[PDB]
Design a protein around this ligand. Structure first.
Ligand SMILES: O=N[O-]
Ligand SMILES: O=N[O-]
Ligand SMILES: O=N[O-]
Ligand SMILES: O=N[O-]
Ligand SMILES: O=N[O-]
Ligand SMILES: O=N[O-]
Ligand SMILES: O=N[O-]
Ligand SMILES: O=N[O-]
Ligand SMILES: O=N[O-]
Ligand SMILES: O=N[O-]
Ligand SMILES: O=N[O-]
Ligand SMILES: O=N[O-]
Ligand SMILES: O=N[O-]
Ligand SMILES: O=N[O-]
Ligand SMILES: O=N[O-]
Ligand SMILES: [Cu+2]
Ligand SMILES: [Cu+2]
Ligand SMILES: [Cu+2]
Ligand SMILES: [Cu+2]
Ligand SMILES: [Cu+2]
Ligand SMILES: [Cu+2]
Lengths: 332, 332, 332
């Protein structure tokens, strides 16, 4: 009887940050209530000033990470205000039945809907918009995110001992296919609707024009770099709703990786680089051991350094010469 | 002494269906006899009426699934009738030596051959044609299939308890590279031989024009949708002889997945999406929990919804509101 | 105190061969000293005589495999002689901190540097050049290799029993992006520097013009085929610094595979084909059971047979008819 369960309202935060939650569950099953507002907006995605009409959950690319526990109920109020132009919906890969909720969540501009589902399987899972006949266009315009369903006793290593993270970040990787004129310049449109047939032709090439973390080239750099301290345990959740990726932390490793993101399986250990298939979210746990700048990249290095799939960590603390040292500095 | 073993003749069925077999072996080792006839035929692969000269085992794309048990002998009579034009052969990834049988099975039009091999390793494995110097052309013209070698005591979960499927389906995914004129229209040829150099140029782009299940856009939809009932245990075998794929059941999961298809390994649990590398067959076990339409897609959604890698399941039975429900239907 | 540890000087050998080493460690931790000299050179990569300006460690593509044990220190003297033109460095994915050593190893032509790091994690790992702002150009010009960090007690199977290899080979797979004129002919340059902007444009296509083992189309064939004897245990280390690959031994299997190359994890068994993600090294163990020619391919067969990702093994010994036999040779 769901009416006797506690309800809790969560306010979502912008990626790469994640709303507050408990790793080990301090209550029994709950109905966890979320609200999301669809926003169609103009987004500038690179240094050149290239602009797309992005389709977003809650104003961001990716949409926010939702965090619940196994056997919680998720109740999502989804709002499509009348300032938008398109029909949208939501498919949760975490959910069972009705096209992951897609069949029950079709909202025209001006409409809302509330969907509930039980989170029966632990792991990180993609969610994405998927309207009949326009599925890839919505997804590759930025309309995807992820949900983490933690086991009620938190994460476990390959032996079954607890793993506790001190910080968690969410990296949404987005493949864009900006249409081009005959000469290779990116085209501009006044509405999302105008671009439809050119977007289809751009997608059919299977060649993205940009691949970005958190919605833009350089989004996770400078003042927006991810931060940590030597000795901190960091969980990085990474999703790609449409195309394969191969994350790598330059200067580090994935100590424990769930590459396909499902926590009933034991993690892979000591990974240099791991494959997250398109349509999947994965999770990597790392304990930082050296201070400095680290780059976190898709290790197709063309995709990383030319197309934009690179961000930075800035890590504070003490340098350990036993792990690494320059014996003779560069010289004649 | 193979002469003292029982022989059994199996008649193959068209995909996505699979010939009858026992999961747990009810006899000792056998010589299981199969026959396949190579057919070159004109195939229409999309709604636009685009036609290719397909090269098939037994008239279908994919070729039929063969099912044996570990330590059976497979004996394959392969017939290339004189109405064909090309030399063909067969490489079984399940087999050991002679290029998977490829070196011993070269048949000109008018010839047959009989190959025997011992199925020493359990799993689902690709088979494909592979004639010297024309390997990708044959494979990407549809000349591939799969064989399942069951452990003699059937399938096991990650703990080692039996897993029993009520139904089994075989999904062959095929990347095609239809050559195009200067303007982007698909070219037409009277024979397979005519297309050779244009096919090579189309392949070298690494960009397929179509990606289909069971030989055509929409082949596993409408009246040809896969069927099941709530509470049935379904095994889906999926192969791709040439290009990576990432299957996903929309509205469901892969409860137990052997992504690289080899049953001595424990399955991966609770998968949303899994990667089957090109040149591999994989297997996913699911128990249906909700009725309705499910889409089974390659979750590069461009490949799925624009290039054709999508099919449907229609599932009958009772709807479970505890797993999912619409709390407030779409409205103002 | 590193000053009390034994030092040992190793001389590197050209791939596909590997310097001598012990599987099970016969000493305690050591500082293992290597030297590498960067060479920029003109390389012919195909039968047509297409030439690139390759950037190499020690004159080869890939660079040589370095082999140490877990908790050894690696000390690398890296020399950029003044006959080169570019700035280079080295990132070891095996190492912790400073961008895998990249931040500390920047050497102009005329300079050297010596870097030390502790090999804390067992597995096969990529190393590659990664100079600020020119990372993919260096990597895709051939400037990558691998290091194997063996557990001190050698390799173990999934149950934990020893696995001992009789031979080891290293296959570096290289994606090249040779720039093309308007008509599709490959362009030629007098220096590496001249090509820079055309190379960037070629890379941005995400479509390699060639994919090769050991630096050229046909490099591991004929007189340069890999050799083995029936009953030998062979370890094949395989790396790809930039793009996903899916190795397959035609006529054989991967009996034990570490697809993502990290030995604290149990191997995958009985693989037909496995995915090594770009930015990763993997390892496959096989025991040969039949004599003859075997092809070792990337099983995107276009990439293999049209773009060049294929080599051969020649295996000597006795033919086993129980595993495979031609019952009726090709005939009318
Ligand atoms: O500006 N709205 O796409
Ligand atoms: O689905 N593209 O990796
Ligand atoms: O091909 N996907 O990175
Ligand atoms: O789904 N594997 O963590
Ligand atoms: O290049 N050594 O000074
Ligand atoms: O019609 N035969 O390709
Ligand atoms: O081999 N192409 O994924
Ligand atoms: O790139 N293979 O879907
Ligand atoms: O090969 N793994 O099931
Ligand atoms: O958009 N709410 O009616
Ligand atoms: O010839 N040196 O690139
Ligand atoms: O990163 N390309 O498979
Ligand atoms: O797409 N990498 O073979
Ligand atoms: O990293 N897996 O062997
Ligand atoms: O094609 N049989 O002789
Ligand atoms: Cu939408
Ligand atoms: Cu989806
Ligand atoms: Cu053929
Ligand atoms: Cu094959
Ligand atoms: Cu370099
Ligand atoms: Cu790297």
């Amino acid at each position: 009887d769901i009416s006797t369960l506690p309800r809790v309202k969560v306010d979502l935060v912008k990626p790469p940050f994640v709303h507050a939650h408990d790793q080990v569950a301090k209550t029994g099953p709950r109905v966890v209530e979320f609200t999301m507002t669809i926003e169609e907006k103009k987004l500038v995605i690179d240094r050149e000033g290239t602009e797309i009409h992005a389709m977003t959950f809650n104003g961001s690319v990716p949409g926010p990470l939702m965090v619940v526990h196994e056997n919680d109920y998720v109740e999502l109020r989804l709002i499509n205000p009348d300032t938008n132009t398109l029909l949208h919906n939501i498919d949760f890969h975490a959910a069972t039945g009705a096209l992951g909720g897609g069949a029950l969540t079709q909202v025209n501009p001006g409409e809302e809907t509330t969907l509930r589902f039980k989170a029966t399987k632990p792991g990180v899972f993609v969610y994405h918009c998927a309207p009949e006949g326009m599925v890839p266009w919505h997804v590759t315009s930025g309309m995807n995110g992820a949900i983490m369903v933690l086991p009620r006793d938190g994460l476990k290593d390959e032996k079954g001992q607890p793993l506790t993270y001190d910080k968690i970040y969410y990296v949404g990787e987005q493949d864009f296919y900006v249409p081009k004129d005959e000469a290779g310049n990116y085209k501009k449109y006044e509405t999302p609707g105008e671009a439809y047939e050119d977007a289809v032709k751009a997608m059919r090439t299977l060649t993205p024009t940009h691949i970005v973390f958190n919605g833009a080239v350089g989004a996770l750099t400078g003042d927006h770099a991810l931060t940590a301290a030597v000795g901190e345990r960091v969980l990085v959740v990474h999703s790609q709703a449409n195309r394969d990726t191969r994350p790598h932390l330059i200067g580090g490793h994935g100590d424990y990786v769930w590459a396909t993101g499902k926590f009933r399986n034991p993690p892979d250990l000591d990974q240099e680089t791991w494959l997250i298939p398109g349509g999947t979210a994965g999770a990597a746990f790392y304990t930082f051991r050296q201070p400095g700048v680290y780059a976190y990249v898709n290790h197709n290095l063309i995709e990383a350094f030319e197309l934009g799939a690179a961000g930075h960590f800035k890590v504070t603390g003490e340098w350990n010469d036993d792990l690494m040292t320059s014996v003779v500095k560069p010289a004649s």
